[PDB]
């Protein structure tokens, strides 16, 4: 009678609660395995993410003990939520695996991008996402880092974001994964200080991969990307190359420039639902909000506020939702530390 048992999923070995039942693997993440199973005592089916020593280096353990601290103490509708943690083996020196057992959604956003959607819809997933944005952002988490396979979905268009995106400071890792870049903002990319709009740009990245079902900017390496992004929206005008670093504003002034396109022509009326009135006002008003959400220079684009008050989002506004209370976060929680105080940390939040 011990309370685990151990079952294959591929080349892992899940060794999990007893009340979890029917594992089936759902996915191969970035520091983890996932699995949906019925949970036997909750009666209703959970996901289950195993962390593999998650304290191998610094990068898998300051993603791992983030994500710990803030989903145990985050609790809003647009937020991924944690129903248990735990860890089979008994002591710290055993102490290898975290497991993280958090509700089921039906699809992430990867999946609902090569489907139209009508604007009711789109609408809705996009206001949730602002809506999750503003709950971090009002406990001073600016995520950086959205994606389109970090936001799930379910049947009933209800919408969670799965992570809390990139830690502060930050580096290497040994990996055959390579991580993301299409939905990082430009301040991100040169490296030049944000603020809490730099989660808009990620936004206006994924509606206009809604839209258009197509990656809007997807450079192998940062210089590609910048290139892809440049050539649509066009050369930032003078005033933000002003606020770059000398060395890399060299880099941005000389790159071949573009006039670059207009809204219109990047997100053509074929695009849209556009048949009856109500569709063409509502593709009208969605072109109008990529166009505020897809600024290049941060100082002009438009913020979670305005994008929630914004006519194709404001249909939904609940204040309920939007001015929720914020998270109460641990401070020093952009912190550096050997792997074996990595370890301590961790297994100490896993254990409270
Ligand atoms: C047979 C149902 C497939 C739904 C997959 C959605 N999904 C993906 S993908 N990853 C996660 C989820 C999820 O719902 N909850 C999670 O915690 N994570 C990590």
């Known amino acids: 009678d011990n309370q685990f048992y151990s079952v294959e999923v591929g080349d892992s070995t899940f060794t999990v609660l007893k009340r979890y039942q029917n594992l089936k693997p759902i996915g191969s993440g970035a520091q983890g395995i996932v699995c949906a199973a019925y949970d036997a005592v909750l009666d209703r089916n959970v996901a289950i993410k195993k962390l593999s020593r998650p304290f191998q280096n610094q990068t898998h353990a300051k993603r791992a003990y983030r994500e710990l601290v803030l989903m145990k103490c985050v609790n809003h509708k647009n937020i991924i939520s944690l129903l248990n943690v735990f860890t089979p083996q008994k002591t710290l020196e055993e102490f290898q695996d975290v497991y993280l057992v958090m509700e089921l959604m039906d699809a992430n956003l990867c999946q609902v991008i090569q489907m139209e959607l009508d604007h009711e819809r789109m609408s809705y997933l996009l206001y949730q996402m602002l809506c999750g944005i503003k709950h971090l952002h009002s406990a001073?988490?600016?995520?950086?880092?959205l994606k389109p396979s970090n936001i799930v979905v379910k049947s009933d268009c209800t919408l969670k974001i799965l992570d809390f995106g990139l830690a502060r400071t930050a580096s290497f890792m040994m990996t055959p994964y390579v991580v993301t870049r299409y939905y990082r903002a430009p301040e991100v990319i040169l490296g030049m200080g944000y603020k809490e709009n730099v989660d808009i740009w990620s936004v206006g990245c994924i509606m206009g991969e809604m839209v258009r079902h197509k990656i809007l900017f997807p450079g192998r390496d940062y210089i590609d990307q910048w290139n892809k992004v440049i050539e649509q929206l066009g050369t930032p005008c003078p005033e933000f190359m002003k606020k770059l670093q000398p060395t890399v504003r060299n880099y941005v002034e000389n790159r071949p420039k573009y006039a670059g396109l207009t809204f219109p022509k990047l997100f053509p009326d074929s695009l849209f639902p556009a048949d009856s009135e109500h569709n063409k006002l509502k593709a009208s008003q969605a072109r109008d909000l990529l166009s505020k959400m897809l600024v290049i220079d941060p100082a002009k684009r438009?913020?979670?506020?305005?994008?929630?008050?914004?006519?194709?989002?404001?249909?939904?506004?609940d204040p309920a939702e939007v001015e929720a209370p914020p998270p109460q976060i641990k401070q020093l929680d952009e912190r550096e530390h050997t792997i074996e105080e990595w370890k301590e940390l961790i297994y100490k939040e896993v254990m409270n």
Do not use: E, F, K, M
Not at 302 to 317: E, F, G, K, R, T
């Open 302 to 317: 438009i913020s979670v506020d305005d994008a929630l008050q914004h006519p194709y989002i404001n249909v939904w506004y």
């Open 140 to 145: 001073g988490i600016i995520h950086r880092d």
